[PDB]
Amino acid sequence: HMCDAFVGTWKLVSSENFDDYMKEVGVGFATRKVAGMAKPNMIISVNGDVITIKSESTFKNTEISFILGQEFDEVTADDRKVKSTITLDGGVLVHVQKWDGKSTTIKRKREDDKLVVECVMKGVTSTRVYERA
Ligand SMILES: CC(C)(CC(=O)O)CC(=O)Nc1cc(Cl)cc(Cl)c1
């Protein structure tokens, strides 16, 4: 019942500073523009200890499955090859990605009827708000 309140199908309803976050990460111009236009759905499910998060949009469909606290390799939507670990910290899903000596952290939180995603790369934070589909 670890992630019950995250499970479901969510649709992006607002974004702030995502282009700048992507710039800070190192994403190139064309990918930033097309990815920034996307209105993804985020589909979260749990089966036993395995959490699956899918992101689907006109730009890209991605899928990760993982066990909390157990590192895995991830190819991101912008084609980084990263080492990822996702944990629960005080009811927040905390996703750390490591590559090329860099690090970014993505937090997913339930707030009211929304799922709020905060993406941090060095001093740059982007906030993406999802609602139930
Ligand atoms: C958690 C997430 C960050 C944001 C969301 O799910 O809303 C997933 C995502 O879109 N990743 C991403 C995509 C591109 Cl193309 C470039 C970079 Cl840096 C990141």
UniProtKB/Swiss-Prot annotation:
One GO cellular component term: nucleus
Example GO molecular function: fatty acid binding
UniProt entry tagged with the keyword Nucleotidyltransferase: no
Phosphotyrosine PTM positions: 21
GO BP annotations, alphabetical order: brown fat cell differentiation; cellular response to lithium ion; cellular response to tumor necrosis factor; cholesterol homeostasis; fatty acid transport; long-chain fatty acid transport; negative regulation of DNA-templated transcription; positive regulation of cold-induced thermogenesis
Domain of life: Eukaryota
N-acetylcysteine: residues carrying this PTM: 3
UniProt KW keywords: Acetylation, Cytoplasm, Lipid-binding, Nucleus, Phosphoprotein, Transport
Quaternary structure, from the entry: Monomer. Homodimer. Interacts with PPARG.
Task of the protein: Lipid transport protein in adipocytes. Binds both long chain fatty acids and retinoic acid. Delivers long-chain fatty acids and retinoic acid to their cognate receptors in the nucleus.
Notes on the domains: Forms a beta-barrel structure that accommodates hydrophobic ligands in its interior.
Family, as annotated: Belongs to the calycin superfamily. Fatty-acid binding protein (FABP) family.
Annotated PANTHER family: FATTY ACID BINDING PROTEIN (PTHR11955)
Protein name: Fatty acid-binding protein, adipocyte
Organism of origin: Homo sapiens
